[model samples]
Target chain A: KPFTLPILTLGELTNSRFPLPIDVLYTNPNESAIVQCQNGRCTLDGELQGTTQLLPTGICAFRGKVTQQVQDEHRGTHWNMTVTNLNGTPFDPTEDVPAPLGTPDFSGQIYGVISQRNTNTVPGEGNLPANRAHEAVIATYSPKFTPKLGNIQFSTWETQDVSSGQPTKFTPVGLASVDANSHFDQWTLPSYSGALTLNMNLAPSVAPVFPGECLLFFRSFIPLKGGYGNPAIDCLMPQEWVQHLYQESAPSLSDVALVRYVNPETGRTLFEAKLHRNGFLTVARNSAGPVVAPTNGYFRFDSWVNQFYTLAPM
Target chain B: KPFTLPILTLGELTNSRFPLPIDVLYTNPNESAIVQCQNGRCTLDGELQGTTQLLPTGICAFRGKVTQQVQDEHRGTHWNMTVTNLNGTPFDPTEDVPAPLGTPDFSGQIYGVISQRNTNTGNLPANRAHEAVIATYSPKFTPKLGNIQFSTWETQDVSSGQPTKFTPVGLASVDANSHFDQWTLPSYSGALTLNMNLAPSVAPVFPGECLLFFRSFIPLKGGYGNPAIDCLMPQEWVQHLYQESAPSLSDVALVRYVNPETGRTLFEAKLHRNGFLTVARNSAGPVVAPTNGYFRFDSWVNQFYTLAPM
Candidate 1:
């Protein structure tokens, strides 16, 4: 039998424009992953911004500490940092600041204003949940990769203005925004500082199923030196065949449609999208039918390349 | 976001005693993968009377061409061969059978007929339609591995005949015989030959579903030292941590209990039948169900093992 296929995301980018920060702060509620720098510069002394604030865009409400930080001269002035366990209170693994800093001062001073947020009724609706439903969570981003943004914030209905004239309609659902300013501790930030702690009370809304393509990574017997084989033949095909022929030569974006059946009960059509590579294809499905709603469905892909299909909705 | 699980089969024993030629013949119907002789003494001189016949305790089958045939008094008769492809006829790619003694006696042959047979059904039920289906057939057997027998005829049900009866009914549908006989070579009486190209035909019966297994010449990861990290863990786990962990261990078995309502997996379960990761608890429901019909659920134990998530 043929080996299972794998779905690998676009290769990691090593460009200089990529943001590298010593610490990243992630606010709760986020539509997409994003980060920003109000001060636009990293302190040479390595002290977290004492007077400079890094504001997170969108609905993120939590904060985090940066574990790994790097500076890229070619990537602009933004500092790139990865925050750990962002659970709201700035940098504090425990103890919620009674009067937490709401907004940041131009010179990194805390504005004592604490606001309480509610958990979104839907599970996995928030950008990052405090208790991850599963043991692990892997997040992949596309297009131009941005590092300064602490978290990816989802655009709000109001921002996109999908529902007009309704004052309270379509409130931004998945992201939370928080203050980015911090005090100058150049001489005294903890040795193990810059971790992002988060309180995941909400998650992104479970939108209706929609049509989307998933990237599949093919890894196995590297492709043959020269590519040629019977399409119907089922002997183990070399893995490199996909990378050399399909990935390297095919158009960046290609569409392959799969027939999806409609749920007799919900009137929703499940779209099974097959990602065609040289030797295999990754299958992704959504019940939203190109729209959005809270539903569940599953799709199959090649397992060897992390492309064995997906189970969504539930 | 765990790796997809694998489907597994139980350690089923073929009924009857040692050297079941007819049973072996029945198992080779889906002749798509390489077949090796396990625990049998047999010869590939094209003659099946004494040398290539299955003994009361030995087993042998055709695999590839018999390149060099050597018979040692102590070690028994051995036919060295290589497999380039698997089909109705298995033989070596390098050499050909010279006339006078042409038609290289045996190409793909199996020896050491053990009770354990792993039938790896590339794809069952769905793909079965593409190939011819055989029900009850017979496997010709000889008493010794090296001695070629000329007048032996053996037959058995396509199935091992343990899970159920041979169901002679199927033989009628496929219009095939449950028995076969060997005849003297047209010119070379020194060798015995078996003819499979029978003109008889029967109505084809769909074998409900059967589990098959086979061993790869190489390990799952081959040379990779950390097979678990690189070879075992399906890349899916690294992509989505929030998703349930799919079964990723070798020897793990995945079973599908198709939900009646959705025509999909209501839940999928994983079990480690062997190895340190033996018997991971069964996982079902959305917590982590299989998204596809196929799964990788089994382990490698000295290169042979059984997997079943009942």
Candidate 2:
């Protein structure tokens, strides 16, 4: 009967500041011997097992004076070694490995706003409850990002002001996967058709009648790895590489703002507008009339002002 | 007819490296006069006005050889001045104003793993998707610091074959708003039982999957604010206060390691407040894992392989 040699498996070895745990496994139960190998002469298991030499194949072998030849039962090859049955696997502990996981590849642009409804019903319709002051709000925005591998999709919404917007700032809500649904009170992001409709049933009592408009900001990262190695293993991609991505993709302040108009009669969006950096409102054709002085609507001013205009219905 | 004084609101005025645009507003007509006021003096339209003193009430008045009592107006009290009709609301630009907005108050511990289903459908109910091999993955981590106000959240997911284990690594995500929601495929905080449900049509994925974990980092005003009120105002804060915040918190690394099975944490952190030494999370846990193990792990395992019994 042929016997199998023990196999040694090493843990993560790149960018390591110290020695990691190593384990050896095999069916050689009765054979217990000291096995050692290193670049320079060293000892293993309390024995002075000296220098190690590498063969043309890059495999390591003990260079001790005592040498022997044994048959490798698995491969049917005769191997030479100072200690035959003890399969000494030497690791460089510095070689680079492929990255294990992938990241989100964020591209394109996402912009929009969340606003409070001025009435309780849809425009031109009067069947819904009236005086439902804070029960109606809208989250209208567009997001553009691709899902390359994982079965995940991205959607975002807005959070209501709990303490009238005290402790927490406006938090951009994030959702993943296609199965995820929007909250009953919060609005959802629409497709990238340059427009989105938010028909949320907010809590009339707790919700604000005219909540301030919270501007949108987005940042994403695409995994560089496809289906290769694990990110934990190949994570030695240099600290500079990570910092470069951070600085390049982080979101910054923008002058552009999202504008909207709501119909007081029916509680539906009359039309949406985009305030350009040059101080002009690009009105959508759906608007009842041209962009007037905003009688019954609101404009998302720049961040510095941090104020939203709520034009009372004339 | 009772007349309202013209109100001239002064904008921010600390370390005025450059003159800001000033606006004068009121219903007064035919009362055109050049207005000028600063510390210790007064001048109207370049006229040589003399000494101006601030009363205990911080009201300013021209105290030259001229002294005259103006008729009682809206308040039924006599007023003084270079121009009494104009109420110079001299704001001490240096006053600390309440922060107009809130920031992400990330504190405590957040941990979890987002595993992809290896198959196409639910494991038992036959509802989940199988071979959705995209489930197994881990994210990479790094951290950076700065001070600015904006709440925009950023998210990144992992690809398969990446390490399935999730470790405590510092990831930077931005959020925009007062209320926040985490992803469904991840898990959130260990404490602060905030009810954020992961309601997917598929198996109600685990409660923790895709949940968000926010780590609180303050946008501290660096010593860069020295010499000027606004960071961009005087460029002096750029060289001084900016460097101060940098040396204080810039290079100090905060290492937090988490146990996958138990959400316990071991932290090593150091911070500098006003250049004062403050050690954080020293008593939270033990430093069981040797720092040198990191170097050894980097040099040891090249890949992962399961042991096959023959």
lDDT of each: 0.20, 0.17
Clashes of 1: 184
TM-score of each: 0.17, 0.15
lDDT of 2 by residue, B163-252 (tens): 111111111111221111211211112122231321111111122111011011211111110010110111111112221222222322
For model 2, state the Cα shift of residue A233 in Å.
21
lDDT of 1 by residue, A83-174 (tens): 22221323332322211111111111111101111222334443311110000001112111112233211121111111111111011111
lDDT string for model 2 (A114-168, tens) is 1111223444433321110001111222122111110112222232211111111
What DockQ does every candidate get? 0.01, 0.01
Docking level for model 1: incorrect
